[PDB]
Amino acid sequence: VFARILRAPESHNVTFGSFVTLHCTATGIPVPTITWIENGNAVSSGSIQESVKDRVIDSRLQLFITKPGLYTCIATNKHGEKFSTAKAAATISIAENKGYCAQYRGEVCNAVLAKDALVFLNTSYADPEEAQELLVHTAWNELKVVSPVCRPAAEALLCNHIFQECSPGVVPTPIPICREYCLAVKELFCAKEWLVMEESEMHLLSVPECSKLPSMHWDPTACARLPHLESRYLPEFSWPESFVLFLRQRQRQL
Amino acid sequence: VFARILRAPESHNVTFGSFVTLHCTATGIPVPTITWIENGNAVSSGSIQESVKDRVIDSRLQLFITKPGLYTCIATNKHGEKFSTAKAAATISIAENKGYCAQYRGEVCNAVLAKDALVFLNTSYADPEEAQELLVHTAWNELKVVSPVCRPAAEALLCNHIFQECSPGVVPTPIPICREYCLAVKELFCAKEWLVMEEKSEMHLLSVPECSKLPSMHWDPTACARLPHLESRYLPEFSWPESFVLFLRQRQRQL
Amino acid sequence: VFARILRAPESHNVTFGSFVTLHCTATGIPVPTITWIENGNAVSSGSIQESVKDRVIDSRLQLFITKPGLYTCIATNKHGEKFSTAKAAATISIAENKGYCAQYRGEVCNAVLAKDALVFLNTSYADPEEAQELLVHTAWNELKVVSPVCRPAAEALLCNHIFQECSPGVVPTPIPICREYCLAVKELFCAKEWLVMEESEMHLLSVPECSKLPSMHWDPTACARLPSRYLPEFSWPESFVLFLRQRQRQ
Amino acid sequence: VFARILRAPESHNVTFGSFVTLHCTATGIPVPTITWIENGNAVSSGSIQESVKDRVIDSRLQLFITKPGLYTCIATNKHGEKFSTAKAAATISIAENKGYCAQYRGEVCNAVLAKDALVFLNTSYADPEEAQELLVHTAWNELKVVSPVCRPAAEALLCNHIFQECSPGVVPTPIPICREYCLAVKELFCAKEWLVMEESEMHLLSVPECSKLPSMHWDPTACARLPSRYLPEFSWPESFVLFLRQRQRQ
Amino acid sequence: VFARILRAPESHNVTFGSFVTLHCTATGIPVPTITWIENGNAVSSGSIQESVKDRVIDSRLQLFITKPGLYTCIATNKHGEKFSTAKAAATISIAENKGYCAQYRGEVCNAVLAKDALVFLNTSYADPEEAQELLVHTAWNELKVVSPVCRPAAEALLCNHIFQECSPGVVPTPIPICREYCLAVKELFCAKEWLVMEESEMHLLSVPECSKLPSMHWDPTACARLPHLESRYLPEFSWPESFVLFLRQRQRQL
Amino acid sequence: VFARILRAPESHNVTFGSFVTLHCTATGIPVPTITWIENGNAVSSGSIQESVKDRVIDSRLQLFITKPGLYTCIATNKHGEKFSTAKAAATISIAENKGYCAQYRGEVCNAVLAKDALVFLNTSYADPEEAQELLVHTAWNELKVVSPVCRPAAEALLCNHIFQECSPGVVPTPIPICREYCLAVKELFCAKEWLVMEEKSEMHLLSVPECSKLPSMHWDPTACARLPHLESRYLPEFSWPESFVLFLRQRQRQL
Amino acid sequence: SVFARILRAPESHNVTFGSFVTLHCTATGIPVPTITWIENGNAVSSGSIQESVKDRVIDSRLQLFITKPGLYTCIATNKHGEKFSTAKAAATISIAENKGYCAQYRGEVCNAVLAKDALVFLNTSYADPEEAQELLVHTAWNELKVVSPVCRPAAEALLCNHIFQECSPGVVPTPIPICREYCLAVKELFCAKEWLVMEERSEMHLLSVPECSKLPSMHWDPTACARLPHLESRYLPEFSWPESFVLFLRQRQ
Amino acid sequence: SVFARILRAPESHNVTFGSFVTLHCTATGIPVPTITWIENGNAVSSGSIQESVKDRVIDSRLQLFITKPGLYTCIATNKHGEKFSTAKAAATISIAENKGYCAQYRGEVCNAVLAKDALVFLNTSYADPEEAQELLVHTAWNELKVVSPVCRPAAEALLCNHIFQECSPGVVPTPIPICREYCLAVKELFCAKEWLVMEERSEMHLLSVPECSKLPSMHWDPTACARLPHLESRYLPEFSWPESFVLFLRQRQ
Numbered sequence A, E: 001v002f003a004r005i006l007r008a009p010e011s012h013n014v015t016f017g018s019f020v021t022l023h024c025t026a027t028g029i030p031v032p033t034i035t036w037i038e039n040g041n042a043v044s045s046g047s048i049q050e051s052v053k054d055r056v057i058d059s060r061l062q063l064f065i066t067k068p069g070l071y072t073c074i075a076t077n078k079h080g081e082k083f084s085t086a087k088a089a090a091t092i093s094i095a096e097n098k099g100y101c102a103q104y105r106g107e108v109c110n111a112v113l114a115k116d117a118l119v120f121l122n123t124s125y126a127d128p129e130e131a132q133e134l135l136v137h138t139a140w141n142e143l144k145v146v147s148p149v150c151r152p153a154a155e156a157l158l159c160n161h162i163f164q165e166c167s168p169g170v171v172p173t174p175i176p177i178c179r180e181y182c183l184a185v186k187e188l189f190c191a192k193e194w195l196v197m198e199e200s201e202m203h204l205l206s207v208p209e210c211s212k213l214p215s216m217h218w219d220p221t222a223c224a225r226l227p228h229l230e231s232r233y234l235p236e237f238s239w240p241e242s243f244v245l246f247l248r249q250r251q252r253q254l
Numbered sequence B, F: 001v002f003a004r005i006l007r008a009p010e011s012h013n014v015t016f017g018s019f020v021t022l023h024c025t026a027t028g029i030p031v032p033t034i035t036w037i038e039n040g041n042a043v044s045s046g047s048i049q050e051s052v053k054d055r056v057i058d059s060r061l062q063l064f065i066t067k068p069g070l071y072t073c074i075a076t077n078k079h080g081e082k083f084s085t086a087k088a089a090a091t092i093s094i095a096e097n098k099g100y101c102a103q104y105r106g107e108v109c110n111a112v113l114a115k116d117a118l119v120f121l122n123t124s125y126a127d128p129e130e131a132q133e134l135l136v137h138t139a140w141n142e143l144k145v146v147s148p149v150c151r152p153a154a155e156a157l158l159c160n161h162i163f164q165e166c167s168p169g170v171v172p173t174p175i176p177i178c179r180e181y182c183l184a185v186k187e188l189f190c191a192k193e194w195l196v197m198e199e200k201s202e203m204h205l206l207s208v209p210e211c212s213k214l215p216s217m218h219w220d221p222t223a224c225a226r227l228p229h230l231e232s233r234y235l236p237e238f239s240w241p242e243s244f245v246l247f248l249r250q251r252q253r254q255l
Numbered sequence C, D: 001v002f003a004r005i006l007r008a009p010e011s012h013n014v015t016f017g018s019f020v021t022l023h024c025t026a027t028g029i030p031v032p033t034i035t036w037i038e039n040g041n042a043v044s045s046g047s048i049q050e051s052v053k054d055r056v057i058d059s060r061l062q063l064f065i066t067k068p069g070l071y072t073c074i075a076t077n078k079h080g081e082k083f084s085t086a087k088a089a090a091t092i093s094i095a096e097n098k099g100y101c102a103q104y105r106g107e108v109c110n111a112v113l114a115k116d117a118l119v120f121l122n123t124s125y126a127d128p129e130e131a132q133e134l135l136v137h138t139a140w141n142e143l144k145v146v147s148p149v150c151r152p153a154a155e156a157l158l159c160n161h162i163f164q165e166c167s168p169g170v171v172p173t174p175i176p177i178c179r180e181y182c183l184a185v186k187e188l189f190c191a192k193e194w195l196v197m198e199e200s201e202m203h204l205l206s207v208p209e210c211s212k213l214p215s216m217h218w219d220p221t222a223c224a225r226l227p228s229r230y231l232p233e234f235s236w237p238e239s240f241v242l243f244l245r246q247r248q249r250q
Numbered sequence G, H: 001s002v003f004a005r006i007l008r009a010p011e012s013h014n015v016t017f018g019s020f021v022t023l024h025c026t027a028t029g030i031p032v033p034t035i036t037w038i039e040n041g042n043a044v045s046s047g048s049i050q051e052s053v054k055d056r057v058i059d060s061r062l063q064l065f066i067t068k069p070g071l072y073t074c075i076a077t078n079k080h081g082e083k084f085s086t087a088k089a090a091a092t093i094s095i096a097e098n099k100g101y102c103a104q105y106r107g108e109v110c111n112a113v114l115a116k117d118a119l120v121f122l123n124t125s126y127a128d129p130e131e132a133q134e135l136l137v138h139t140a141w142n143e144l145k146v147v148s149p150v151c152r153p154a155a156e157a158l159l160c161n162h163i164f165q166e167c168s169p170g171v172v173p174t175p176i177p178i179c180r181e182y183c184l185a186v187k188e189l190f191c192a193k194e195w196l197v198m199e200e201r202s203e204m205h206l207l208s209v210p211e212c213s214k215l216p217s218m219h220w221d222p223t224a225c226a227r228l229p230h231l232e233s234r235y236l237p238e239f240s241w242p243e244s245f246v247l248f249l250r251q252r253q
């Protein structure tokens, strides 16, 4: 009846830039709830998938490991007005050319990156294509709410900065974004958005800082420029996929 | 080779609160794009589904009609630097017991509404269940970015305000939201979010509650729905979006 | 057992400036609560004295009637997650040489007013010595927090404006406060407090408007002129003082 | 007759967290006033009970001693335009398993705390049930004015933080409030009030610092979690309530 | 012993722009004090001279009459804690080429106006030289505190605007100040001073409003310009005459 | 014809708090002007008396010496557009019981100080009575424009602070101003005036009271001077200045 | 002859709408006088003064673009001692009485924006169409005042395309207007700060500064209005020497 | 020959302090390339580019006032498709190694301020003194940026008298500096707003913009510093047409 942890988090030793999944299952009546703690506070960046299988709760915390940490599982169910709690912890610790060129095979940048181009994948991460995919989402999480004028420029800028094209040659090396590209987005298309964000290692690796970028006039061949942003007259409020699917199901029930 | 419209949108004469779909089909080389115009401006609220096959683009615009309007589809392709365009317009017109009670059978409010309560469906809308579902989405879109403290209160406030519980009286009449419930969300949990929204519409008036028009919980605690208990969840500060979670799941399954 | 009202409020037909008590008793399991509604909203000004005995709650709302109103008592208890509510309403209505001089016998102005002077009791009120005692308390509620340098000035100003002195002469006539007096407290000693309050028929009877006062220089016989303790910064509440006392006696 | 002190304050050597009363009586024509000085400045926290009989003023300063101090009583009267002052000083000094569980028997927390639970009484204080009753009153003085939506949240927060519940087990140990609880009242219900107060050894013992609290999600068995009246807008002061009462009995 | 008015204010009928003196004497033990009221409020512009002659107080209110008014005398002495008050009132009421050219014979503008020039004296006032002298003081009272950079420009501007020179010719007519002169003082030398004053018939007649003045470029001969303001390195705090006389008396007592 | 200095200023070696007079005499055609310079800048505090007779200008600069300084007189006349100038400099140097009690025999504080009380005269000044008289003037000059509410309080505060009453103890020691007196003037009667002054000096430190350094009236009501009663006078809103009152008196006497 | 005297007075003219006129004033005196031009009693709102001073004689020419009637005055002034001497002479400009033609742009202000292979619409409502619209571009620049380096290329394109509009295809001379979104992008992005300064009414403003709400939308018909061009950036010197100094240096070398 | 190629490269020079130098770059390509000038890796801080494009060839000349060593780079670029082609060529400017003389002012920027009968001090610390100080005046104007009509005459006088200082009487060429009160009047009155914008360090700033605290006082000795002159106001047109348009109109007529 009381909360009890069956499968507990297993400590893991992983390499920098590895995606790891921690597991924790608990049982009890009522079915307990699982909370994941990271070094005393809530997890800073991750995803939790939960499945209530009758009386057992399955909780999976997925992480992108760049620093070591102690992750703790907290299972709790309430009895009358008295909570019951079980705990189990795991320790994630880090072990130990510059990259390779490949076609982008992800989803977040499919509309911005050309399919005939080769981008640079940083082998400092054990899972490069997945790590840099997450960096693009991380930046969008930092920019937060995005105005219609800002989204195409921000999508292009972040995609071109994290999935940079490869220079001509046999040694893999990325084409940076030009300083003017960066300041165009920062000071024009996304001026308000950047301001709020100016009010973290993931931030440093994903959000571009314009001062560290070359100027397009020093050598226009040696950096990437503001792409042509195709303007679309899409509806101001475009109904979410959730509502569109809901409508279609109601039509299918005649 | 130039852009041409095969199936033009057709004029509609519907009742208040009806969902319609406008169709526009075009051809050309290259395949044209189709852009929808609402009274000379972009569609305020709608959904566009598009499909291209063998130099033919089929575009469908879904709308929730509450005012008349002139809708035009613009088919445009480009040869060199010169554009080629064809237009076709359609006119949507409006034509012409207060409601009924039923169980909620939607998704947007599934985590808030009891799976047994009877909510009020406003039959001033031709499509009450779908109309009120869209209203919750409409409200969420006005609030825009929400704090982790605000999202539970807003989800509760909007769902209870749009899908109001039916009073136990024999006549279908909704139980309103209490003023203290609305003021708690607007002034405490969602203080910043409400300010940004007010800084910046019939859809807004029907979807976002105005607390001044609400009754007080103390006048009769049985005649208004109060702030439900909200559970803190201690989720990650940045929860990876669904798009990424699928991507990572699929790629880890490839191996 | 759902909430039930036993004694309902009765309607009253009082005269201007009367003190009236409305009664409402209720019972239930659990014992219900009693809320009072005035003309749809909360009670603007009053006192609620409540008692519970043998599963009966006895609520009494005391008011100062200057305007007619509709009062309602709301009896409410809960059974699990469902409230149960009983309502009962009552209407207070108004019915039907300007005063008299006497010694001040109240409490709120015991320090400012003199123990050997005659104040003006406005017989437009049915209960003059209350009404004016309440009016002083009403003004203090308008000023809210007061600074240590503002309190002695506000106490004097309010007590002299509401308990005005009687003019020498057979006809009872109040001696008002001078405009300079009022302007001094409003623009100097209580300037902050006055500003926050400038940000109600009770308000305009209790708080002076300097603009509608005579000037000391017009005739300094016809109005009253402006007349420190180093107390503890946090002076303990009398509740704790009595709590301390009752327990040392044991 | 110039002001003369009769009984002077005596020095005291008390233990940490004791309640002490200092006495000072004076006489003169006119009857002098008695002011109290603490370490050169005004008394930070205390209660002064004064009485005058047969041209003798009996002043009593009650304090809660947590730190040593130098107290002085200033007896003052006036003869025309010249003040006359007598002084007398006294020094309070400090001298020389962590508590016990018991039922709450005070007044300030009679609503928030349960009548059938055990709270932790910190025996670091010589007078535990006072000290913590005073500490709650001390926090209310820090928040000053509270909004109607902030008051019920502050009452709960203060009463649960100062009268913490005892953990199950033989060793008496207090159950603290969760950080989320504290953060909720500070950032939502009492956010304004908290901001004006963020603009003292007594302060840090009476008012919670959310940063130094456990999290509910770490273990929701190890801390206390967050647990409306539509009263009159201006609820008459008890002083006027009693003034009204005493006179209707006559 | 009580306050009593011996000589009372005498009502007068006067012409526009006349200086009048109202009298009021009172006696009593203690010697009373006199207060002058003008239409219920304190006198807006005037001067009071008082002389305590043993047990009689003499009070003289001097006024510049442009509008009718009711002036009231209030004599009051205190007995214990009870004031005694006597009152007496008077009513000032108004009766009924454009001017003449003369040398300035006043004091307030002696350092600004040339002694060989002829200024315009507006005969709409019964006492022109005295009225326009008062207008200069009135303006200084409106400008209030004056910075060292502002005083020479303000002194010149007000003096040149109220004591304007006479145009060449046989019909008396004044030379206005140029708009540029006015805006120079208003927006440069006295910018802060003017701002405070922007936060009354006497004001309108004495303070220049720059928009109603001609421009010096329309005809440089037809208006008066910013005079050369001689700069002096006088001490920042120049001791008042009161202190200088005090020092000298102490030297004379050896 | 060019500017020449006949009697140059002479160097002085005085004690702290001494009043001195520097002399400078010049001649020329035209008669030169004489300008006084204090350490390369304008004299901070002083009084200049000048006299011209038969192409000779006699200028005297009165000072209250508290610091050493280099004083220079500049004699300048103008021929055409070219200036002609002669300079002469003098060096004032500083050289080397706390006070005494006496009756006030000044003017600046005559309406505030009792005509029988004994005030404290600080003998750190070579010229105590004149020094403290100048200090009141110095303070008034810092306050600048004063409201009709402020002038009585300021007059009282400064006079009581500069000419403090002597304590009845046998040793001359001044009775200070209470903190409550100073805070009342600075924060109530003269609130605006004090703010403008603080926005913008040894003379300032000796003349304008700082309330934080003052004792409290409640520590011992006999050891500090409290806010005296100030009488409202209901004078005209604009009282004609003395210059005008004389002018009008004289001209009305001409007739 | 010592005091200011006008030798050549300005002469009254009757011109058609949108005509460039030049008024003349010659004055003499010892010292040589100054000549101030006054337009309806204020300063000339828009114009150009070229004056040459030769010893005792000043010749002042005032160029104007005439769209409204006006009275213009020459004020000749010299000073002897502290007294001024002034001579005046007035002259009245009054107004008499297919929408245009297509031609290649041949001006200076838009040469970096307008294509050589394009024909622009010249509004024959003006007597001197090419010179009038050239001035309209300059007039808009003056309303815009201080332009940032990022605003300058966008504002140059916007004003040039709006005042020298490309001729619509067909045989009837008609202008192609700039699109709303073109205008809005310059006003709300590239020149956001410059546009807010200007917003805080003159006929020259209305003719020169576009109002974006009265413009057609590119999404209505992309062929029917001018879209935002591809702006070219330049790494010009932070302080680029003024032309007057370039010429001064040329003479010395 | 299609891609950008530099025909004439910039050449390194060794000049003396305060020398005017002109760097040359000629490039060819189809389409004709652009030429960007880079100074120590940033934009040229102060200079002037004159470029002429003739079909397939661009000739760019960059004028500079040399006071510090620097490396200057020519960047020739054209575009074929969506790909750029870039040619670079660098050149290094390095520096070699009575305080002045008196002469009549003969420049353009101060001709309305400086008297014909005055001799000004030319600082021979510069190789080209008259041209250097002329540029210093322009450089100060650029620091001052937007000047009001009331500030302009005062700022013109102040900078001109400060950079072209009158020669002190005697046989040794020495400058007469402007007085503190002159400077303070412009900074605290006429140009009060312009001066606060500038206050929110470069060697060109220090040489061109006066600092009033390092100036002598007119009350010390009125003969020893330049006092504030009598400023002359002008009723110029509110919008005075730019010189480029005046010249454009001249050609058409």
Ligand SMILES: *[C@@H]1O[C@H](CO)[C@@H](O)[C@H](O)[C@H]1NC(C)=O
Residues within 6 Å of the ligand: D013, D093, D094, D095, D096
């Ligand atoms: C208080 O009593 C303790 C007892 O040991 C003593 O040590 C201390 O000095 C006393 N303090 C006083 C008398 O101030």
